[PDB]
């Protein structure tokens, strides 16, 4: 049938693929299973940290000199990873503006935070974000962060299939608001409305794509309010100056 999700109370352990007991696992875990089961679980637990352990392969791409994908152990400082395996950012902690640790479904990490955050399931999970798929993205000081977030929200609009209403409607709306905020055609109460919409969608959808559509804009208006307010103020001033003629 069409690619639409189900309701969870029949968890896919007693009513799954054909109604049979069927579980879904990512290719990561099921592909790592043989060697972890052969080389003993202690050799595995001897990595990462106490509650987060194992070797995960990150795919670092975006605004680095050498876009790469390499496997490291969890709880690795972002500085260490980027500066060691991948190429150093065009300016090492100089023109690096934003970092998205997880996939596109994870709130941002500004420059001041990510200098000394560990890379595991808990450290940045405690900061605000989530490791998710561990696809770290970096964005220099010469890239409109609000434009990147708007493009991500457009993607989420173009992917939410639309079974239940919150995700569908709210995602179209979020893309529209993010475009208007990219150009600068809004007010401040509009960014508070953005936060409110984010909260509603995140709360009340079927499964995690609602949270996916809500998280990036939430992190944006959490860690990047001043520049957004500056864009709004400059557009308002330019509009007034033009209207005076």
């Amino acid at each position: 049938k069409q690619g639409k999700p189900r309701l969870k109370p029949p968890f896919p352990a007693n009513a799954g693929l054909y109604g049979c007991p069927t579980t879904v696992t990512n290719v990561e875990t099921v592909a790592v299973s043989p060697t972890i089961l052969r080389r003993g679980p202690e050799w595995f637990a001897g990595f990462g940290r106490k509650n987060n352990a194992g070797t995960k392969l990150f795919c670092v791409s975006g605004h680095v000199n050498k876009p790469c994908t390499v496997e490291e152990e969890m709880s690795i400082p972002l500085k260490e990873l980027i500066e060691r395996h991948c190429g150093g950012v065009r300016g090492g902690w100089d023109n690096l503006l934003a970092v998205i640790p997880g996939g596109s479904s994870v709130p941002l990490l500004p420059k001041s935070i990510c200098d000394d955050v560990l890379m595991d399931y808990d450290a940045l999970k405690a900061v605000q974000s989530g490791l998710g798929t561990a696809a770290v993205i970096v964005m220099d000081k010469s890239t409109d962060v609000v434009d990147a977030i708007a493009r991500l929200s457009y993607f989420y609009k173009h992917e939410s299939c639309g079974q239940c209403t919150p995700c569908r409607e709210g995602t179209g709306w979020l893309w529209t608001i993010m475009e208007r905020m990219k150009v600068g055609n809004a007010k401040l109460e509009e960014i508070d409305m953005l936060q409110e919409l984010t909260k509603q969608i995140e709360g009340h959808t079927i499964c995690a794509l609602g949270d996916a559509a809500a998280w990036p804009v939430q992190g944006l208006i959490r860690h990047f309010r001043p520049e957004l307010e500056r864009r709004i103020r400059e557009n308002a001033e330019r509009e007034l100056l033009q209207a005076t003629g």
Partner: protein, 71 residues
């Protein structure tokens, strides 16, 4: 559903948005009067009484002179 309807032109926030122009001008227009005031400036007692009595006496004198002429 209120921002541009109320006022679109140039505000930066929802406050200081509209222009209303509803009530009174600055000053309350006036202090007004509400208490009655009826001035009593007519000739009060002795003026009117002397007028009546004097005109009566003089009219009687005139009637006398006239009846003299008519006789």
């Amino acid at each position: 559903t209120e921002a541009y309807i109320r006022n679109k032109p140039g505000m930066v926030s929802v406050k200081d948005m509209p222009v209303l122009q509803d009530g009174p001008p600055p000053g309350g227009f006036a202090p007004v009067r509400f208490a009655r005031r009826i001035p009593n400036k007519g000739p009060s007692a002795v003026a009117i009484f002397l007028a009546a009595f004097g005109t009566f006496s003089w009219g009687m004198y005139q009637v006398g002179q006239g009846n003299k002429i008519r006789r």
